[PDB]
Amino acid sequence: PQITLWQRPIVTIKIGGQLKEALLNTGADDTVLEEVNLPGRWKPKLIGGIGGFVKVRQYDQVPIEICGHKVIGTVLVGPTPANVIGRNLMTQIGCTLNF
Amino acid sequence: PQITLWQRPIVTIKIGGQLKEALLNTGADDTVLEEVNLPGRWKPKLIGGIGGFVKVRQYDQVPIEICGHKVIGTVLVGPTPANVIGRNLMTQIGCTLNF
Numbered sequence A, B: 001p002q003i004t005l006w007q008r009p010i011v012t013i014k015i016g017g018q019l020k021e022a023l024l025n026t027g028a029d030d031t032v033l034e035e036v037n038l039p040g041r042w043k044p045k046l047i048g049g050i051g052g053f054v055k056v057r058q059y060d061q062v063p064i065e066i067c068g069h070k071v072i073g074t075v076l077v078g079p080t081p082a083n084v085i086g087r088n089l090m091t092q093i094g095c096t097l098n099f
């Protein structure tokens, strides 16, 4: 699956059992998903900080699938304008930039 | 040239007969650059997704070169803690995402 960017690269991930929309952001380095509940333990983490850091939850080693791409990776949780895949999960599904 | 993402995709471009470094951002619809005179006319444009827009200048059909691919597209110039290469140009040079 190769993906021109003429349209914004939104994909469907399966995560938490449930399925959701997300954006493959090479510009984003960590992965935030709108509010979701996941099991077991986590540790707080700040991100953003242009005008404040938002505080979110850090879950590590989480099962997620992206495009039949079953992967497992660190996944922040809490407020987000929208689900965002970042470089953290992309490397583990093996995404590259290609021209 | 295939750019894994363990790292921020920061490539050098040559816009303006100057040389800049800039980040490869599929998360970004446009290409915004840190002020840099350019000839030509301009339209004002707003960007920024929250607590205000950002006003900045739109130029069109500009010559830039990205990792040695020379190409033509709209580029926005003004206030951004960072150069940003967003999809507009990535299509132009024919970069994709793969996995």
Ligand SMILES: Cc1cccc(C)c1OCC(=O)N[C@@H](Cc1ccccc1)[C@@H](O)C[C@H](Cc1ccccc1)NC(=O)[C@H](C(C)C)N1CCCNC1=O
Pocket: A025, A027, A028, A029, A030, A032, A047, A048, A050, A079, A080, A081, A082, A083, A084, B023, B027, B028, B049, B079, B080, B081, B082, B083, B084
């Ligand atoms: C949390 C969240 C949920 C949903 C959607 C969005 C847009 C959300 O995140 C906010 C955010 O800054 N997202 C970025 C990626 C992101 C999200 C979470 C963790 C890490 C990164 C990116 O996409 C947009 C954002 C906008 C920007 C903010 C400040 C000044 C100018 C531009 N751009 C930037 O931050 C980039 C950085 C990351 C190299 N940026 C900074 C310097 C100048 N130019 C530039 O392009």
